[PDB]
């Protein structure tokens with residue numbers, strides 16, 4: 279995916295609920311720093327739904343690709359209000375940006 283295109287997507291559709299940097303505050307949604315390689319619902323200090331905490335999968339390019347296409351379908355009961363991103367390419371770009379931004 280194209281990191282720059284993904285940055286634009288993040289800023290327009292995710293930033294209002296999520297920060298990606300280390301130490302970034304939790305907002306409506308949890309801070310995403312360290313996302314890749316971590317299990318669902320493990321960011322300290324954020325009140326996740328039990329649905330998210332119990333999904334039990336590990337966040338990575340593959341799991342994110344599915345989750346972002348339709349959040350509610352992948353994690354029934356999640357309190358994340360987001361319809362999903364239909365275009366495969368857009369999800370690829372966004373995930374490429376997340377891979378970088380949540381690890382710097």
Ligand code: HEM
Nearest residue numbers: 291292295306307318319320326327330356357358359360
């Ligand atoms: C496309 C943009 C977005 C992406 C890529 C995204 C991604 C994520 C990810 C990966 C998680 C899981 C974190 C974890 O398990 O530690 C999450 C959780 C969450 N997100 Fe988002 N998110 C986006 C937009 C939003 C928006 C717009 C809202 C709010 C209106 C939101 C609200 C939440 C909430 C409330 C949770 C925690 C849900 C729960 O505990 O069930 N997100 N998001």
